[PDB]
Structures are given as structure tokens and as C-alpha cells.
């Protein structure tokens, strides 16, 4: 099965071919391609960073025939009219928010181990401060690690922040900016901390 999709960004790639094509491209570039899930799915594969790619499902509804692009498309549980709307309203916002995160003074580039090392070093120098940074989750594209220590002697905790097209999802909420995500992280942890100290008897 080889579908003729009439779109400037359509390529008949498997996931590995899509990643190879994007390897020399820049953050935010993408391809649309046939899905292994069937003739009512497509995939948009996009580049986050060097050797870091995310493949997102596009579910097709209102198909006029088995091979034609559906007139309604579902991405991340939201409805879109066509592939250009997905590019503009889903993908481009997601890329915008990725750049907002990696431009933040709370973001650290490098592998998880690299950032843990910086956190440990920072904690060694500042043993009575609580420390936290964001970094890229290379094993789960589209997520950030949120790593923190309460103090030098505390364990290093890893939480997980999901990048979405409308903000940064942490625990129960989709923060619309990195500043609000940082404020919210602190509030959430203050709340859990004060709950731990409650006297239930």
C-alpha cells in the first residue's frame, strides 16, 4: 500500500527514513508520512535536537475512500481540518515552547548524567540550597527531566515534564510558560512538603 497524499511535506518514509532525512535539518523541521497503523493514520515526524526526533500519530476521520486523506484529523485528542492547520497550530506552537524551554536559565544542555553531575557539583558548593534544573529527556522525545535536590544530603529526585502544543505538563496542569512552570513546581512541592509534615493523629 502506497498512498498518494498531495502535500508539500509528504514523504513515503518509515520512521528510520524520516529520522535520516531530518538528520541534517534544523529544530522544528518535519515530514508527514504514511503510518504503520493503517490507511486511516499518518505520522508527523519532527526534529527536536541533534539525533532527537518525535513521531506523532494523526488519526483520520471522514475519509471519502480508503486511501484519501480524511477531512477531519485528530492529533493529541484535538480536531484539525487539514495538515496545514496541524503544522501551524500544533507543531509550530510545540516548537515555540521547546525553544522557550531551552532558552531558559533553568535549562541545562546535555545528557541526564551530565546534568546530574552539574546538580551534584552545584549542591556540593551550595549545600543548604534547594536546586533544580530542566533538561532534555533523550530516551523519551518530547519530555524534559525536572531534576532537583532539597539540599546536599538529599536524594536527587527526577520528575517529568511533557511538552505539549499549549504548554508544559507537570503532574496535573499544563503551564503556559516556563516561568509559570517554575512557580508551579515550587508551589506543588511546598504543598506536598507541608502535607508530609501534617499531624494526622
Amino acid at each position: 500500500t502506497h498512498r498518494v497524499i498531495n502535500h508539500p511535506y509528504y514523504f513515503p518514509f518509515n520512521g528510520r527514513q524520516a529520522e535520516d532525512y531530518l538528520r541534517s535539518k534544523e529544530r522544528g523541521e518535519f515530514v508527514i508520512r504514511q503510518s504503520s497503523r493503517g490507511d486511516d493514520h499518518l505520522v508527523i515526524t519532527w526534529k527536536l535536537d541533534k539525533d532527537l526526533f518525535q513521531h506523532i500519530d494523526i488519526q483520520e476521520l471522514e475519509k471519502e475512500n480508503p486511501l484519501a486523506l480524511g477531512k477531519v484529523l485528530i492529533v493529541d485528542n484535538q480536531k484539525y481540518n487539514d495538515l496545514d492547520q496541524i503544522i501551524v497550530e500544533y507543531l509550530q506552537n510545540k516548537v515555540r515552547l521547546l525553544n522557550e524551554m531551552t532558552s531558559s536559565e533553568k535549562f541545562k544542555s546535555g545528557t541526564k548524567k551530565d546534568v546530574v553531575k552539574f546538580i551534584e557539583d552545584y549542591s556540593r558548593v551550595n549545600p543548604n540550597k534547594s536546586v533544580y534544573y530542566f533538561s532534555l529527556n533523550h530516551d523519551n522525545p518530547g519530555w524534559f527531566y525536572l531534576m532537583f535536590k532539597i539540599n546536599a544530603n538529599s536524594k536527587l529526585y527526577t520528575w517529568n515534564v511533557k511538552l505539549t502544543n499549549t504548554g508544559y505538563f507537570l503532574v496535573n496542569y499544563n503551564y503556559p510558560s516556563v516561568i509559570q512552570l517554575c512557580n508551579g513546581f515550587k508551589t506543588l512541592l511546598k504543598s506536598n512538603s507541608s502535607k508530609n509534615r501534617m499531624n494526622n493523629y
Partner: protein, 31 residues
């Protein structure tokens, strides 16, 4: 198929298991 769909993953957060006093930097204006 073989391709992973990382937007479909769910990653579990470690529970905070300490009474230690938090000492994070201040909250800041959202702008």
C-alpha cells in the same frame, strides 16, 4: 510497527518522601 510514539508515553514521578525544609529560589513575576 517498530516506530516509538513518545507522545503516548507516561512517565511516573518519584514521590517526595522527606519533611526537609525547601530552600528554592524565589517565585518570580510571570510577565
Amino acid at each position: 510497527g517498530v516506530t516509538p510514539y513518545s507522545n503516548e508515553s507516561g512517565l511516573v514521578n518519584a514521590d517526595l518522601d522527606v519533611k526537609d525544609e525547601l530552600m528554592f529560589s524565589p517565585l518570580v513575576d510571570s510577565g
